[PDB]
Design a protein around this ligand. Structure first.
Ligand code: VN3
Ligand SMILES: [Mg+2]
Ligand SMILES: [Mg+2]
Lengths: 252, 252
């Protein structure tokens, strides 16, 4: 059993902390159950959280493995081995300029904004904003609500893909949480262990995650998507519930 | 006679060049007629055009005098004395953050954007974008079209003023071309020379300039505001016609 889980609004609280998750998290670890972050966040953001590989960054664009991963894959990053699944950021940004020319109105993302602007926009510290701006694959977009429809069409027209992270739209090519989860499972040292996967998430960018797992759980704020399971309370308390009620019993 | 002139679309062509206005400027210079740029550009942009003081920047936000101006006014800054008529950029920016809170909606301006983004949005080179970003008084805003109304109301609620410059909205407090012109005329060394003022502009937002001068000339496209003289052709060619027909004969 491997647990794949979103961070913001799933495992992390309203200020990116943990909440009751410590309880549940420490429990899974004690039982030897691998927990794998699958997030829209960047590697720098994941590192600042103290999280260790394997983890999946930027909506599936990068899959990070420990340096000594028993299954040889990806390229060395000094401490890691990286499996790049998506186009690099610079290519997404270039292609975004063409979407913008097509749309005939500004299309702004994180790459266009100062760390100060991103911090003000998100409520983050200046430092956290710099880490969110250090993107390798995926662009976070800051779109006008009424321009969204025209913008998404322009993205499609120029060969980009889009998703929604909970507050912001994202643009990328080849980044998909489920594709990254499938790749990691296929690279797992213990095939029997990987044969059963759990997925927890809260946003549109997590539908690909739910479809790639065997047991899917929605701890988001609204109604569960097609056929996925639910919890009494959202976020980290929904996470704790899922572990106690859905997971532990399946460990027999 | 003092000639006050708008730059872009008036004294400069669509390439930022002088064209037929070059000979006209030389002619005025030869007759000792002072010419005073009145522009929405920053001091850094004006310097890159190689223009010497006196000149008026950022839509009347600031009046730049030569350091040795015979009338003592403004604050010494290198080879200038600066008469600040508007609130400083830093204060406008602070007020913008207050407005953003009130509007419950992001309000993005040049200060939030990289030079690269400003360049992309304006068609400028990165270097010219950097000079466009070195603002001392007014902020250029990049507003969502369906959000303008609410944003503008919030700007006013926090004591800011706004205008629409043709492409973007602008925010400032106390920046008014007409007031800057009246001030410079009041600070003119020779009161007799300052009693007759010419204003040339190419846009409807030059109206404050047109009101503060005695002879107002519009070289833009379509019809001039009521009370304002027009020329057969637009831009620098109109500037040329204006000097020849209205100014030159008057100097004899
Ligand atoms: O950690 V997430 O909001 O994809
Ligand atoms: Mg999330
Ligand atoms: Mg103009």
């Amino acid at each position: 059993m491997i647990v794949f889980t979103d961070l913001d609004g799933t495992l992390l609280d309203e200020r990116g902390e943990l909440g009751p998750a410590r309880e549940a998290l420490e429990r899974l670890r004690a039982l030897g159950v691998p927990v794998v972050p699958v997030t829209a966040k960047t590697r720098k953001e994941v590192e600042a959280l103290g999280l260790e590989p394997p983890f999946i960054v930027e909506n599936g664009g990068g899959l990070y493995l420990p340096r000594d991963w028993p299954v040889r894959a990806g390229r060395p990053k000094g401490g890691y081995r990286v499996v790049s699944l998506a186009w690099p950021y610079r290519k997404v940004r270039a292609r975004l300029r063409e979407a913008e020319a097509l749309a005939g109105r500004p299309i702004l993302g994180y790459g266009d904004l100062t760390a100060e602007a991103v911090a003000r926009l998100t409520g983050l510290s200046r430092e956290a904003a710099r880490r969110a701006k250090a993107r390798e694959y995926d662009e976070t977009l800051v779109l006008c609500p009424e321009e969204v429809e025209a913008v998404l069409e322009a993205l499609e027209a120029v060969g980009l893909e889009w998703t929604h992270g909970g507050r912001f739209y994202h643009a990328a090519k080849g980044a998909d949480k489920g594709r990254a989860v499938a790749r990691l499972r296929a690279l797992w040292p213990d095939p029997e262990e990987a044969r059963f996967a759990v997925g927890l998430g809260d946003s549109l960018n997590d539908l690909p995650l739910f479809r790639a797992v065997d047991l899917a759980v929605y701890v988001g704020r609204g109604d569960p998507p097609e056929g996925v399971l639910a919890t009494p309370a959202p976020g980290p308390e929904g996470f704790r519930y899922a572990v106690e009620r859905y997971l532990l019993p399946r460990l027999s």
